[PDB]
Scaffold this active site. Structure first.
Site, PDB file in Angstrom:
ATOM      1  N   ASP A  53       3.773  -9.505   5.552  1.00  0.00           N
ATOM      2  CA  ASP A  53       3.883  -8.887   6.868  1.00  0.00           C
ATOM      3  C   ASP A  53       5.260  -8.264   7.063  1.00  0.00           C
ATOM      4  OD1 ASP A  53       2.897  -8.415   9.645  1.00  0.00           O
ATOM      5  OD2 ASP A  53       4.528  -9.794  10.157  1.00  0.00           O
ATOM      6  N   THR A  67       1.486  -4.414  12.270  1.00  0.00           N
ATOM      7  CA  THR A  67       2.932  -4.594  12.189  1.00  0.00           C
ATOM      8  C   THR A  67       3.532  -3.812  11.024  1.00  0.00           C
ATOM      9  OG1 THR A  67       2.733  -6.837  13.102  1.00  0.00           O
ATOM     10  CG2 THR A  67       4.803  -6.265  12.023  1.00  0.00           C
ATOM     11  N   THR A  68       2.746  -3.639   9.967  1.00  0.00           N
ATOM     12  CA  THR A  68       3.189  -2.904   8.790  1.00  0.00           C
ATOM     13  C   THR A  68       3.164  -1.397   9.030  1.00  0.00           C
ATOM     14  OG1 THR A  68       1.114  -3.895   8.004  1.00  0.00           O
ATOM     15  CG2 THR A  68       3.052  -4.093   6.576  1.00  0.00           C
ATOM     16  N   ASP A 108      -4.310 -15.752  14.756  1.00  0.00           N
ATOM     17  CA  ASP A 108      -4.837 -14.399  14.640  1.00  0.00           C
ATOM     18  C   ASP A 108      -6.101 -14.242  15.478  1.00  0.00           C
ATOM     19  OD1 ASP A 108      -2.931 -13.517  12.494  1.00  0.00           O
ATOM     20  OD2 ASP A 108      -3.966 -15.092  11.368  1.00  0.00           O
TER      21      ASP A 108
END
Lengths: 481, 481, 481
Positions: free
Chosen positions: C56, C89-90, C349
């Site tokens: 991540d 997030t990436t 998640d």
């Protein structure tokens, strides 16, 4: 055979002047980027690893470790232009610099500094008289007030809600308009919600300390006290002998005295912010007393309504309806912390310009419109007064054209073309010709409601000019290695 | 072997001459810029990071890193000039340099140092002979006095009101005039009001206790009392049984005692510093008595008027119109204590110039006019007297043209082209003509009202001549460390 | 002389711009390789030794020490994205590093910075609107809430119990749908048993110290205290005066103090983490009093039953039945910490996904579908918007091809080739047209069961762009340090 120890610089002739002026120029051109409602803020970083992102020149110049004497001068200027009105802070600084850069130019032309100062002295005064012929005279028209406040809040972060703060800043200056009193306007910055949640309290506001104490005291004689009510019973008694219903302690009140207050029907509030304790003595009239053995029946202020409303789930003590209703407290609410703090000052300044409208009923036209007029005025005058005075007055005008020039640059719109378009269209459209960034072309300033306050420009021209003169009178300084 | 250790500096032969020349010439060129009303200000920032914007040479040299011996000497010339009369602290500096600047010339020709001093000495002795010849002995002349004072308060921060300062200076000197004593002039300085408020009292301005007390005592009978009236009817009674109507306590004063004394109609001032109490005794003659029992009817002082006036909301006690006001008082009011400091200092000079005048009715004409006249005389007298001293006198005269040439320089006009019209219009219309740095050119000084005491120029030549001479005799300085 | 001391930074135009774009992009490239189902993990071994092998971007950017602020910006994005949607997030960073590298292609040409920032904004306002209006806005709907939790539980070690983990997540949120407050759903792990034993309790469950303390108060009156209870009797006695039968100290607790709390029948739990004290404050209503003194009866919270349950040989302080289920607790059980670590993480998640689904009942098909979607319309938007924006916007569209290009990359397919196949199968197809890295080629992503909530994309685009736009205006920022 040695006048200065090994390591003592000696700026002589041009080098001395070149160094002096440039130093200020750099500082002037630095904050220059933050010009117009479309500049580039700087992310300053002190010595404590602090990230400072602001568009206000003043603040920027106050966090920068200035290691130059001349520069420090600008720090003052920007400190004055900001403590008087607000915006233009960048202007006065930048302009002052360019002048010096134009000075070092004439110096290279073998033009003695003195004559240069003389030329600018004539030009400046000449340009001043001019700003009068263009300065439109206004007069309780809640319309122009908004146009003036909306132009002060712009070019900032509040530009998004500038319309909301405009009605607030103007609504407070119209209510408390007895002779322009900004000392009767309190600013309450609190976190919780967006900027569109801010309002204007028609009275003093200062965000109890006892569930036994009377929350809402209609008719209460506020008694200000600095020292705390701790070492207790004699404290509550003496206070009861003065006949008070509302006690305001700056410090902390012990538990015992707190009990006698609620049992005697005397609402009290400990730990009162000094800034909130100072205005209280000016909003209700309650004279602040030191010990509890000093206050009497003359230290009691008159308040018609002291209630506590949980506004936004927060307990706010309202002292609305004070003896002299000529005092309010605009409450500001911001989501983050910089937003709230950046909005606060934004309103403070907005209050200043309005203080200038209530006394200085003179307004001008921004968008580089004012300057271009000056530049064209001082020019014709320059040709009238021969001698080196000419080139001076001339270079002064050309230095005033930079204002709009930069206003076009930070717009992506070529300045070279703007100067010609503006200057030419200014000799045809009179003084009603100003730059319009949002359209990328010259437009009418009065038709767009773009008007600055006389005080603003006047100060700048008078400031930089004279100031620079002295800077040009120096030709040998002893600073640091 | 090694005669002188390291960390020294030995000037032998032409090495000593050269060093001083380049070292002094420079320091002389520095101050030269600050000469005249067009003088260029300098900023002396020491190592503490403190700014120093001054126009006075002594103030610039006292903050300049002076390591060379020669430079230090130039620092003692301005300091001496500033410790005696003060005015022209710049001249002596620039003057000294010029002479040396010329001297070097004669030196490189093979002319020995000692000899240079000779010529410059004879010439100087004659330079004064002429300056004391062109002078027009001034008249208790109210007109010229107020003028000369204005010629000293010009180009300064007190120029905005040089009229009020001069007025006070004239009267102050005229009063204590008997040969004028600068001691009989008390310069009281306190914060409050502005520069324009500064006044002069024909008595003693001692920096009331009760309100209703007589704020206007005609011929008071000052009862100088030390011991406090603290723990009140009998104590105040006796002070009323002596005839005194003005009680002056050096210590505390019990409120109870103040009201009682009020009923008697006697204004009193408590907490009167030792100095004040002593001075008041020297002004009215009142005798300082210990306890309230030693207070008789011959310890009482007599002041023409004792009124407490608020000099800019700064209420103070005024003791003027005394029997023998041998000690006058010049109250210099004003906002920023900094501005006043400038005013108080200039005042000093304004008063000294008057004194040098009163004790010597002889005045010359500035603007370089005198300098030109002399430079011409010395030259012709240099011819009437051959010998190697001839070239010396000539050079001396050439060094008497710098002052004027500098004026034209700092004014902006070409120094050379200026002296062209000067030397010309001077020989034609007597030396009464000089250089008007305001109108850029020549003009009659006597008419422009640009007069200066004879002692100013007179002393100026001296000091500069004497110092420079010393250095000339210095051909070696072994300084260890 | 010096105007800008050393060590200080003064990022100027050409320099700062280039700098911010270069490394930022590089930084993006770093985690760029960790994008996709077959991304590439990196072992992060800081100074101490703590090795962190994460994929991540956030977990990477936060584990790496950034020197210059420009790079830190990306860290803020991935960090902001990790809280606004969790997934993506990436991407966010990557896209950002693409806009920067794309914009530069415009700068070098001659395009002025501000104009570029302005342009990118237009594409952002339009862009985001595209993804939305093109997304699939389904019904909260209890069913869908379970489908969003299931697809977020599988592909992990919790898929084995996804059927039981999905509901709890739906219930936890349905009790906090004030629009979901993640910080309202506190999770507590407790080694032992099995994950199938996970239960969602309605109330804040912390992670007894008084044997004689009421380990089970029915009608409690929660009392928070920060100050430690040391020298004791007077402190404990005061606590029983407010009625507090559940003292929760943040600091330590003395034995003598414990004995006094065990006699008054007051359950006390010492050494309570600061994080816990804050949650008990926002769940029970009990105000965390600093000093034991300030503690009053109005700081008492409301707890239906504060007992000491022994969840799987574990002594936890259960405080369910709070006043105001906004705070649900999920007790995760697992033989080893490894299996429990996965449960907790995977669950987190399942929560984040339901959170995104509620903040936007839409959903876009990933696989680079929305990227090429925008990239297409944006390229067309330029050709119609005109202005310098055209070129800019196009590059803003091409800068999107990176996401799908990188997918095929981390899949082993030919990025260039694959993307082209997509762009073609996209126009001829629909928006659901994406790339299946698991099969090597294009396919109907939606029909493949690979959907993603709109919030995911919206957040990324919004944040990224606004930032990139801002940075473009970063061409002058002095560090002054």
């Amino acid at each position: 055979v040695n006048i200065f120890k090994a390591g003592a610089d000696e700026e002589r002739a041009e080098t001395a002047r070149l160094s002096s002026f440039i130093g200020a120029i750099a500082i002037g051109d630095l904050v220059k980027s933050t010009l117009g409602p479309k500049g580039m803020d700087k992310i300053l970083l002190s010595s404590d690893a602090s990230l400072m992102v602001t568009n206000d020149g003043a603040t920027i110049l106050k966090n920068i470790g200035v290691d130059n004497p001349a520069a420090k001068v600008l720090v003052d200027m920007s400190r004055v232009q900001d403590d008087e009105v607000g915006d233009g802070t960048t202007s006065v600084t930048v302009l002052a610099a360019e002048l010096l850069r134009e000075a070092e130019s004439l110096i290279a032309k073998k033009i003695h500094p003195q004559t240069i100062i003389a030329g600018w002295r004539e030009a400046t005064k000449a340009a001043r008289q001019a700003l009068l012929n263009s300065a439109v005279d206004h007069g309780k028209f809640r319309q122009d007030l908004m146009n003036i406040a909306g132009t002060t809040l712009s070019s900032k972060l509040l530009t998004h809600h500038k319309d909301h703060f405009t009605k607030l800043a103007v609504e407070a200056v119209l209510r408390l308009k007895g002779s322009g009193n900004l000392e009767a306007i309190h600013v309450i910055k609190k976190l919780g919600g967006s900027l569109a949640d801010s309002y204007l309290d028609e009275g003093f506001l200062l965000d109890k300390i006892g569930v036994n104490q009377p929350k809402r005291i209609e008719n209460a004689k506020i008694l200000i006290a600095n020292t705390g009510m701790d070492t207790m019973k004699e404290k509550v008694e003496r206070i009861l002998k003065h006949g008070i219903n509302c006690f305001i302690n700056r410090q902390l009140i012990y538990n015992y005295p707190e009990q006698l207050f609620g049992a005697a029907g005397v609402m009290a509030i400990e730990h009162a912010d000094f800034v909130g304790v100072e205005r209280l003595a000016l909003v209700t009239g309650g004279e602040i007393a030191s010990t509890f053995d000093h206050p009497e029946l003359v230290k009691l202020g008159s308040c018609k309504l002291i209630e506590e409303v949980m506004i936004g789930e927060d307990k706010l003590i309202h002292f609305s309806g004070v003896a002299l209703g000529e005092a309010c407290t605009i409450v500001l609410r911001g989501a983050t912390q910089q937003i709230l703090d950046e909005a606060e000052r934004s309103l403070h300044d907005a209050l200043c310009v309005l203080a200038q409208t209530v006394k200085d009923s003179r307004t001008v036209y921004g968008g580089g419109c004012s300057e271009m007029l000056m530049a064209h005025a001082v020019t014709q005058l320059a040709s009238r007064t021969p001698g080196k005075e000419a080139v001076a007055m001339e270079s002064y005008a050309k230095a005033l054209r930079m204002l709009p020039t930069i206003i076009a640059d930070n717009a992506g719109y070529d300045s070279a073309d703007l100067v010609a378009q503006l200057r030419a269209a200014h000799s045809e459209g009179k003084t009603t010709a100003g730059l319009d960034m949002k359209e990328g072309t010259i437009g009418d300033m009065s038709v767009l409601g773009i008007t600055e306050s006389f005080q603003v420009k006047r100060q700048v021209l008078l400031s930089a000019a004279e100031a620079a003169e002295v800077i040009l009178r120096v030709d040998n300084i002893i600073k640091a290695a | 072997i090694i005669k002188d250790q390291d960390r020294k500096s030995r000037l032998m032969g032409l090495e000593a001459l050269k060093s001083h020349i380049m070292a002094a010439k420079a320091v002389a060129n520095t101050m030269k810029t600050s000469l005249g009303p067009n003088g260029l200000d300098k900023m002396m920032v020491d190592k503490d990071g403190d700014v120093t914007v001054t126009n006075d040479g002594a103030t610039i040299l006292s903050m300049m890193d002076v390591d060379h011996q020669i430079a230090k000497l130039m620092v003692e010339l301005s300091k001496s000039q500033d410790d005696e009369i003060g005015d022209g602290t710049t001249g002596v500096v620039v003057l000294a340099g010029a002479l040396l600047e010329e001297a070097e010339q004669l030196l490189d020709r093979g002319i020995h140092p000692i000899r240079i001093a000779d010529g410059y000495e004879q010439a100087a002795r004659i330079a004064i002979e002429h300056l004391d010849k062109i002078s027009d002995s001034v008249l208790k002349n109210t007109e010229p006095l107020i003028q000369t004072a204005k010629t000293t308060l010009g180009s300064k921060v007190v120029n905005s009101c040089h009229r009020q300062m001069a007025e006070i200076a004239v009267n102050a000197v005229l009063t204590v005039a008997d040969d004028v004593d600068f001691e009989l002039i008390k310069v009281e300085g306190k914060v409050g009001g502005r520069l324009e408020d500064t006044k002069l009292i024909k008595g003693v301005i001692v920096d009331f206790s009760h309100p209703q007390m007589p704020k206007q005592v005609e011929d008071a009978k000052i009862a100088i009392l030390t011991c406090p009236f603290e723990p009140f009817e009998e104590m105040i009674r006796q002070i009323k049984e002596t005839g005194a109507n003005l009680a002056i306590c050096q210590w505390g004063f019990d409120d109870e005692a103040n009201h009682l004394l009020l009923q008697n109609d006697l204004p009193a001032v408590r907490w009167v510093g030792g100095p004040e109490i002593e001075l008041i005794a020297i002004a009215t003659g009142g005798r300082i008595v210990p306890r309230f029992s030693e207070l008789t009817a011959e310890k009482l002082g007599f002041a023409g008027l004792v009124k407490e006036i608020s000099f800019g909301k700064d209420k103070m006690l005024v003791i003027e119109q005394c029997k023998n006001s041998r000690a006058v008082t010049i109250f210099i009011r004003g906002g920023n204590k900094m501005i006043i400091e400038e005013a108080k200092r200039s005042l000093h000079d304004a008063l000294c110039v008057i004194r040098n005048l009163i004790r010597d009715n002889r005045v010359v004409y500035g603007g370089g006019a005198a300098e030109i006249s002399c430079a011409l005389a010395v030259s012709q007298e240099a011819d009437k007297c051959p010998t190697l001293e001839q070239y010396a006198m000539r050079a001396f005269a050439d060094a008497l043209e710098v002052i004027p040439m500098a004026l034209a320089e700092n004014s902006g006009m070409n120094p050379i082209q200026t002296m062209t019209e000067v030397r010309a219009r001077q020989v034609k219309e007597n030396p009464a003509l000089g250089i008007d740095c305001l109108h850029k050119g020549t003009n009659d000084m006597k008419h422009q009202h640009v007069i200066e005491t004879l002692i100013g120029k007179k002393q100026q030549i001296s000091l500069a001549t004497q110092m420079v001479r010393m250095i000339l005799k210095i051909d070696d300085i072994r300084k260890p460390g | 002389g010096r105007g800008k001391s050393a060590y200080q930074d003064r990022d100027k135009p050409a320099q700062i711009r280039f700098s911010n774009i270069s490394a930022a992009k590089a930084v993006a490239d770093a985690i760029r390789t960790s994008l996709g189902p077959k991304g590439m993990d990196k072992m992060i071994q800081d100074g101490k030794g703590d090795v962190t092998i994460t994929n991540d971007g956030a977990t990477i950017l936060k584990q790496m020490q950034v020197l210059h602020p420009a790079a830190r910006m990306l860290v803020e994005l991935s960090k902001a994205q990790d809280i606004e949607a969790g997934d993506g997030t990436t991407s966010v960073v990557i896209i950002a590093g693409s806009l920067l590298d794309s914009c530069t292609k415009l700068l070098q040409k001659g395009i002025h910075p501000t104009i570029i920032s302005e342009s990118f904004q237009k594409a952002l306002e339009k862009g985001i609107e595209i993804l939305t209006d093109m997304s699939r806005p389904v019904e909260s709907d209890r069913e869908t809430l379970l489908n969003s939790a299931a697809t977020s539980l599988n592909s992990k070690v919790v898929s084995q119990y996804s059927s039981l983990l999905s509901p709890m997540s739906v219930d936890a949120v349905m009790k906090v749908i004030d629009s979901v407050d993640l910080r309202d759903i506190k999770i507590v792990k407790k080694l032992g048993g099995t994950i199938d034993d996970c239960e969602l309790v309605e109330g804040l469950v912390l992670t007894k110290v008084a044997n004689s303390g009421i380990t089970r108060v029915e009608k409690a009156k929660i009392g928070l205290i920060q100050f430690c209870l040391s020298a004791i009797l007077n402190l404990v006695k005061q606590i029983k005066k407010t009625g507090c039968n559940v003292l929760l100290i943040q600091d330590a607790l003395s034995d003598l103090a414990l004995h006094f709390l065990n006699k008054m029948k007051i359950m006390v739990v010492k050494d309570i983490e600061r994080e816990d004290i804050e949650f008990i404050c926002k769940t029970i209503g009990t105000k965390p009093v600093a000093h034991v003194d300030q503690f009053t009866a109005d700081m008492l919270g409301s707890a239906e039953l504060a007992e000491e349950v022994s969840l799987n040989s574990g002594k936890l302080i259960k405080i369910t039945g709070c006043a105001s289920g906004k705070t649900v607790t999920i007790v995760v059980r697992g033989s080893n910490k490894l299996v429990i670590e996965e449960a907790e993480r995977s669950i987190h998640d399942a929560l984040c996904v339901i959170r995104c689904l509620v903040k936007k009942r839409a959903l876009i098909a990933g696989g680079g579908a929305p990227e090429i979607e925008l990239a297409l319309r944006l390229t067309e938007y330029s050709r119609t918007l005109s202005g310098m924006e055209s070129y800019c916007i196009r590059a803003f569209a091409d800068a999107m091809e990176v996401i799908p290009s990188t997918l095929a990359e981390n899949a082993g397919l030919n990025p260039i080739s694959t993307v082209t196949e997509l762009r073609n199968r996209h126009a001829q197809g629909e928006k659901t047209t994406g790339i299946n890295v698991r099969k090597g080629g294009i396919s109907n992503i939606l029909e493949e069961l690979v959907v993603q909530p709109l919030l995911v994309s919206v957040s990324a685009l919004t944040l990224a762009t606004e930032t990139v736009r801002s940075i473009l205006k970063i061409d002058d920022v002095v560090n002054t340090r």
